Design a protein around this ligand. Structure first.
Ligand SMILES: CCCCCCCCCCCCCCC(=O)CSCCNC(=O)CCNC(=O)[C@H](O)C(C)(C)COP(=O)(O)OP(=O)(O)OC[C@H]1O[C@@H](n2cnc3c(N)ncnc32)[C@H](O)[C@@H]1OP(=O)(O)O
Ligand SMILES: CCCCCCCCCCCCCCCC(=O)OC[C@@H](O)COP(=O)(O)O
Length: 651
């Protein structure tokens, strides 16, 4: 029971006729309920006459004086900030854009998909007069257009978008303002001199408080940059802090939060290989628009009350303070302000996990995952389809929705075409059937791994258990296995999201080991578990072990490089030196997985070593220097770290 948003017929309009059926797209746009009264009125002057914004202007004035006529200058400066921040929505512009996007999307997307039952729950959240917060996952540039367009198509008033200062340029900026995008400064720092702009913070905080006070829907991307690995990066708690600061003071009654999972079959930007490693524009843009991409599916997670969440947290016991170093180091080597700063960081992480889980599994996503890990060398089309059907059902067994819904045979033939740069379709002698082999070259591999990462969040937990089984072997004690897997969670903590922030890594592995008993892979003999020895079960175990190949091999390779590290180094210079070493391994052909050379896994590897405390980080001016820690100063300790990460990866 889904709905296509792009599909428009004489049935969708009120008037049916020879003329009307031709102008169907125009008739649909003239039947929307966007009548201008609902949007924010007189924002600028309502922000200027807020007590704190006046206190900020009043204090910045009291700094510049060596009687006090300089309030007008800083007030005029403060007005000029708001002039280029606040969005002025024009429903005239909305309808024109909506008509253009309906034509453009219908060209280069095969369809867009909405679950009706979900969007009735968003409609119910609109029917209550109370402000909403739409928090989507950032995948592509098309994310900005999709969320607004889907509400506009169900005549829910268009949201105000927290727009990056990057997009603010002459002429083009005022078009964004008409469509509800309000530009926000990056880093709340105009210049180092004076530190934070007390004036600018007051205006930003004031604007958001004023915009929520008039009961209107807000859209914030928690991931500052769109993901280049193909999986959700770490959260940013910058704007949520203001929203919670609003609700904390009891200036507004309550806010409803909606995590939004957007999924593409093939993103418009295509591959990311260029940034994943290290006239002319006009040719590239025209070549992009003519290419027809696959399906799209936007899912809305059930909305919750921020007040009810924030209360529920205040009832919970003492938050665990276990440090990543304090957790792991024992295994490898045998505050009033901070409490709230943790509370917002947890909320942000909690939303992104809910948002990431809501994203549907596309045909491409599965095909990539099967090609890279289940076969790799190459397999026949008839054989690939039989494996595709077995993969398809495993995703539905864990309660994830699929984007593809057609015939199993066809969907794969459609999916292979979209990965045409990565894949080659040959002919086997004496076999009237297509043979497929994925590209193992460093430029091509990355593109497959990007679309393959789409399915990783389904199997990430079982994969952590599947690796632990191999680690504990080289009968299994229940307590011993879970403790081993719990340590691997802290190691792979930095990359992606593994569990909900409320649940500890122990109990998640403990219930995942519980699920392994249900499936019948492990059987009960503290308790002793036996691994089942069947042709069907083993190929599932080996699949899950290979699925954490790149993630572990990158860390293994990074840990080897750490051996020959001398003297303090700048991090931006160090990342380049480390990245080159992983790229070298793929050229020499000593590396098992070419996927591991990706830049995202280099950032994670270095950011992970900081948390364990291999690198001591003192920072000055802009760039932070990396000093070798007192614990990992000697040669023997660096080898002990390498050995531990090696124990997980297959040999
Ligand atoms: C049918 C019609 C269709 C119509 C079509 C419509 C289409 C229109 C197009 C619209 C275009 C839209 C573009 C959207 C994009 O491209 C997305 S660009 C990301 C934007 N949003 C964000 O940036 C999200 C994250 N925001 C932030 O992080 C911030 O907003 C900044 C940004 C300041 C960075 O932050 P900064 O570098 O300053 O560092 P910070 O670490 O965040 O610290 C800043 C301050 O934030 C507070 N804070 C931070 N962490 C916490 C925390 N955990 N708990 C509590 N408070 C916290 C605290 O005040 C600490 O200050 P200090 O540095 O002094 O500690
Ligand atoms: C503002 C709304 C007005 C309505 C019109 C909007 C229509 C959609 C605009 C097209 C989407 C944006 C195009 C971005 C182009 C771009 O960024 O180039 C692609 C490269 O990075 C990819 O490089 P690589 O990662 O090396 O493959």
């Amino acid at each position: 029971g889904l709905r296509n948003v792009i599909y428009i017929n004489e049935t969708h309009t009120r008037h049916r006729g020879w003329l009307a059926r031709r102008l169907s797209y125009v008739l649909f746009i003239q039947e929307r309920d966007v009548h201008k009264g609902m949007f924010a009125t007189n924002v600028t002057e309502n922000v200027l006459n807020s007590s704190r914004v006046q206190e900020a202007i009043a204090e910045v004035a009291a700094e510049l004086n060596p009687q006090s006529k300089a309030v007008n200058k800083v007030k005029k400066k403060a007005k000029r900030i708001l002039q280029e921040m606040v969005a002025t929505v024009s429903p005239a512009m909305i309808r024109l854009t909506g008509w253009v996007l309906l034509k453009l999307f219908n060209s280069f997307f095969w369809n867009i998909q909405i679950h009706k039952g979900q969007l009735e729950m968003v409609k119910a959240a609109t029917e209550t007069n109370l402000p909403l917060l739409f928090l989507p996952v950032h995948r592509s540039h098309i994310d900005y257009l999709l969320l607004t367009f889907i509400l506009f198509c169900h005549n829910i008033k268009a949201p105000y978008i927290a727009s990056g200062n990057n997009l603010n340029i002459p002429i083009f900026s005022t078009l964004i303002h008409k469509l509800g995008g309000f530009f926000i400064r990056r880093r709340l720092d105009e210049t180092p001199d004076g530190r934070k702009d007390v004036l600018y913070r007051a205006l930003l905080h004031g604007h958001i408080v004023e915009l929520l006070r008039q009961q209107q829907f807000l859209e914030i991307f928690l991931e500052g940059t769109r993901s280049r690995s193909g999986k959700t990066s770490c959260a940013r708690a910058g704007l949520l802090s203001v929203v919670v600061d609003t609700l904390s003071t009891n200036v507004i009654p309550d806010i409803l939060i909606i995590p939004v999972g957007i999924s593409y079959d093939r993103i418009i930007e295509g591959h990311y290989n260029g940034e994943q490693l290290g006239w002319s524009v006009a040719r590239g843009v025209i070549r992009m628009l003519r290419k027809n991409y696959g399906c799209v599916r936007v899912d809305f997670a059930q909305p919750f009350s921020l007040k009810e969440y924030l209360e529920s947290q205040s009832q919970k016991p003492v938050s665990a303070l276990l440090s990543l170093e304090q957790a792991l180091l024992p295994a490898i080597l045998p505050t009033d302000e901070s409490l709230r700063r943790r509370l917002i960081a947890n909320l942000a992480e909690h939303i992104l996990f809910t948002a990431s889980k809501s994203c549907a599994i596309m045909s491409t996503h599965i095909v990539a995952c099967l090609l890279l890990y289940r076969h790799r060398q190459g397999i026949d089309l008839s054989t690939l389809v039989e494996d595709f059907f077995v993969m398809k059902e495993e995703v539905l067994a864990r309660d994830f929705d699929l984007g593809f819904s057609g015939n199993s045979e066809d969907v794969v033939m459609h999916a292979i075409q979209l990965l045409g740069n990565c894949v080659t379709i040959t002919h086997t002698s004496r076999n009237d059937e297509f043979f497929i082999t994925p590209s193992t070259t460093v430029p091509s591999v990355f593109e497959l791994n990007f679309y393959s990462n789409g399915v990783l969040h389904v199997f990430i937990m079982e994969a952590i258990i599947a690796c632990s089984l191999y680690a504990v072997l080289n009968l299994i004690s229940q307590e011993q296995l879970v403790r081993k897997a719990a340590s691997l969670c802290y190691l792979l903590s930095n990359e992606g999201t593994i569990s909900l922030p409320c649940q500890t890594f122990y109990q998640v592995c403990h219930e995942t080991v519980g699920k392994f008993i249900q499936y019948g892979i492990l059987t009960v003999a503290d308790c002793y578990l036996k691994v089942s020895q069947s042709k069907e079960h083993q190929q599932f175990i080996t699949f899950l072990q290979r699925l954490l190949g790149p993630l572990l091999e990158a860390y293994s390779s990074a840990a080897i490089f750490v051996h020959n590290f001398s003297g303090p180094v700048p991090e931006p210079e160090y990342l380049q030196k480390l990245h080159k070493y992983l790229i070298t391994r793929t050229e020499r052909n000593v590396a098992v997985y070419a996927e591991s050379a990706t830049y995202c896994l280099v950032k994670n590897a270095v950011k992970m070593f900081k948390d364990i405390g291999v690198f001591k980080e003192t920072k000055q001016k802009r760039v932070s220097v990396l000093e070798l820690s007192s614990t990992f100063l000697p040669q023997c300790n660096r080898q002990k770290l390498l050995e531990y990460i090696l124990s997980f990866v297959v040999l």
